[PDB]
Design a protein around this ligand. Structure first.
Ligand code: MLS
Ligand code: ZN
Length: 272
């Protein structure tokens, strides 16, 4: 038997995929996870004892972003190995496009929480290779099921590009993406590029957009192609869209939900 259900915080969540928890943990009816330190437990009774003794009320590492009650912690996988291994085990219950990270040390994890008087409650995270040869600014991204399709994924996508901008580089998520990840990235790219096209007094090129957004030229071009806003001329893609056409697209339902924004002013991060 695999783990088929977890209790974490106030949530019970059914598993989507196999995750390699030890066999004695999988055979239980449920796995119980401390929402702050991510220790996993076999029994409601050990969980309740842990709840009363654990001192953690937020992720470890540095809080590199805080605006109102939305926070991001930066967690080095080498410095917090057990926490990050447990995070990976949790995530693997809900991801199958990513083999489980039996080694978390090459990665830094950006943990998203929303905060109340009780503590900082984990919503999801993305991981990033400390040195990525390719142009990957996200290695894995996971939003816990009860928080999916509620703006948190968009926030983490935006956040990963804000880091890329601070590194003066373009970046792209490692592939493959989940089906929801694919739709989320495509909508994020579409919204960002449309917004810039609407607001920029003048002619933006694809290279311009890539420098302003840290989205790769390849992801910009495929996005503009899906929007039918690019011509081809003598071997180059060229943006071709009227201001009215940009406005029409931006009025679509895909972009009607007010985002959780990433306020650059609240981001406390310098490149290493
Ligand atoms: C990468 C990833 C992985 C797993 C789950 C999610 C997710 O929950 N996406 N839905 S969303 O956050 O509400 C979301 C994403 C991009 C959006 C772009 C434009 C407008 C609205 C958006 C809403 C995810 F984004
Ligand atoms: Zn704990």
């Amino acid at each position: 038997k695999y783990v088929d259900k977890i209790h974490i915080g106030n949530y019970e969540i059914d598993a989507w995929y196999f995750s390699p928890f030890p066999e004695d943990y999988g055979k239980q009816p449920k796995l119980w996870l401390c929402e702050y330190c991510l220790k996993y437990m076999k029994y409601e009774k050990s969980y309740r004892f842990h709840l009363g003794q654990c001192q953690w009320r937020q992720p470890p590492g540095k809080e590199i972003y805080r605006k109102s009650n939305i926070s991001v912690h930066e967690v080095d996988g080498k410095d917090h190995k057990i926490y990050c291994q447990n995070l990976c085990l949790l995530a693997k219950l809900f991801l199958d496009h990513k083999t489980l990270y039996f080694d978390v040390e090459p990665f830094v994890f950006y943990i998203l929480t929303e905060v109340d008087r009780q503590g900082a409650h984990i919503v999801g995270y993305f991981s990033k290779e400390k040195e990525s040869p390719d142009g990957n600014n996200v290695s894995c991204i996971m939003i816990l099921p009860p928080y999916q399709r509620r703006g948190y994924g968009r926030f983490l996508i935006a956040f990963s590009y804000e880091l890329s901008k601070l590194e003066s580089t373009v970046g792209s998520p490692e592939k493959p993406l989940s089906d929801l990840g694919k739709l989320s990235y495509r909508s994020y790219w579409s919204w960002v590029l449309l917004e810039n096209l609407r607001d920029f007094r003048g002619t933006l090129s694809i290279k311009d957009l890539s420098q302003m957004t840290s989205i790769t030229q390849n992801d910009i071009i495929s996005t503009l192609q899906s929007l039918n806003m690019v011509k081809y001329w003598k071997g180059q893609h060229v943006i071709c869209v009227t201001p009215k056409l940009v406005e029409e697209h931006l009025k679509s339902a895909q972009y009607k939900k007010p985002p959780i924004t990433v306020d650059s002013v609240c981001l406390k991060w310098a490149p290493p």
